[PDB]
Amino acid sequence: GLGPLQIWQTDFTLEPRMAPRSWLAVTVDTASSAIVVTQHGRVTSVAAQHHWATAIAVLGRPKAIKTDNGSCFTSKSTREWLARWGIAHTTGIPGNSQGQAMVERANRLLKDKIRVLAEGDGFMKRIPTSKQGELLAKAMYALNHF
Amino acid sequence: GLGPLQIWQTDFTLEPRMAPRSWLAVTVDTASSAIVVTQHGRVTSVAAQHHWATAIAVLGRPKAIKTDNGSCFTSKSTREWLARWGIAHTTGIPGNSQGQAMVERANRLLKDKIRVLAEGDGFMKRIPTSKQGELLAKAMYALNHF
């Protein structure tokens, strides 16, 4: 009733231990702080939509999503995908202050956990392709359900 | 405190509109009724573990999981994966009554929603490979967050 508004912050961050699909799309729900992450081979408009599709099935549909002015976020294709869902989009204050400090903190936490868990299993550099999936799920589990 | 126990029921069901990865692994959390589904090319022990890895990141770690006696569920590899996580496994009453009526109801609901949504987008038969992912996420969203 008076609970937090369902606004998300989403960003892409690069992680060479997950190559070839080293681009991680990360979404923080600012109401509950849950984190959602997916892996992509390239940072395109289609990869952001695929990421939000998965986040929507996991967290439910938000009232709005805050992103930066990356092209994969302000392109026509992406503005139409968001309108088809009824989700408002804002790139925040124009010149900002980066009102997406949350996703940026999530990004560092996420890369740390990936590195500790991978090193925990003997992978000092790249994680074998076949192990990437479970480790990513595992880092996401440790970050949400502490 | 007195809330429901966190027990899951999981099963695989076949869906030719999602081919080539037409095997759907579906998990119902009997405490909250949420549904989790993932797509696989073959029904193996490794595909069940990958499915639960994703369900664990989405729903948190359960106290137990109820399955049937499929080999991909009672194999050594799978019993060890479950022990590594500390999750109890039961195949229920031996000769049963099928105390996994829930996952079976979820399976029919899920296949219906997939068919209505696909037909809604003009796909009377197989769904194009590139559209499978979002539609699956979409059916999962409609079934959880009604």
Q: How many CB atoms lie within 10 A of CB A84?
A: 9
Q: Which two tokens stand for residue A107?
A: 């990004």
What CA–CA distance (Å, rounded) separates B15 from B18? 6
CATH architecture of A1-146: 2-Layer Sandwich (3.30)
User: What is the widest separation between alpha-carbon atoms in chain B?
Assistant: 48
Q: Tell the residue number behind the tokens 């695929």, with chain if given.
A: A50
List all residues 6 or more positions away from A119 whose beta carbon is below 8 Å from its beta carbon.
Answer: none
| Domain-wise residue ranges, chain B | 1-146
Termini Cα distance of chain A: 26
Give, in degrees to the nearest 5, the angle at Cα B40 between B15 and B110.
Answer: 40
Count how many pairs of residues, chain A against chain B, have C-beta atoms within 8 Å. Answer: 43
Q: Tell the residue number behind the tokens 């509109």, with chain if given.
A: B17
Q: CB distance A57–B141 less than 8 Å?
A: yes
- Chain A residues inside the 8 Å CB shell of B58: 58
Q: CB distance B61–A141 less than 8 Å?
A: yes
**Nearest residue to A50 via CA among B138, B53, B21:** B138
What CA–CA distance (Å, rounded) separates B41 from B21? 4
What CA–CA distance (Å, rounded) separates A73 from A67? 7
What CA–CA distance (Å, rounded) separates B14 from B48? 14
**B5 CA to centre of own chain:** 19
List all residues 6 or more positions away from B142 whose beta carbon is below 8 Å from its beta carbon.
Answer: B113, B117
Of residues A53, A56, A137, nearest to B57 (C-beta): A137
Amino acid type, B72: C
What kind and span of H or E run contains A71? helix A71-74
Q: In Å, how far is B92's CA from the nearest CA of chain A?
A: 27
User: What is the widest separation between alpha-carbon atoms in chain A?
Assistant: 48
Q: What is the resolution of this structure in A?
A: 2.2
Question: What technique was this entry resolved by?
Answer: X-ray
Q: CB distance B57–A141 less than 8 Å?
A: yes
Q: CB distance A50–B138 less than 8 Å?
A: no
List all residues 6 or more positions away from B109 whose beta carbon is below 8 Å from its beta carbon.
Answer: B35, B143
**Nearest residue to B138 via CA among B62, B48, B40, B35:** B35
Asked if B36 and B102 count as a contact pair (C-beta separation under 8 A), the reply is no
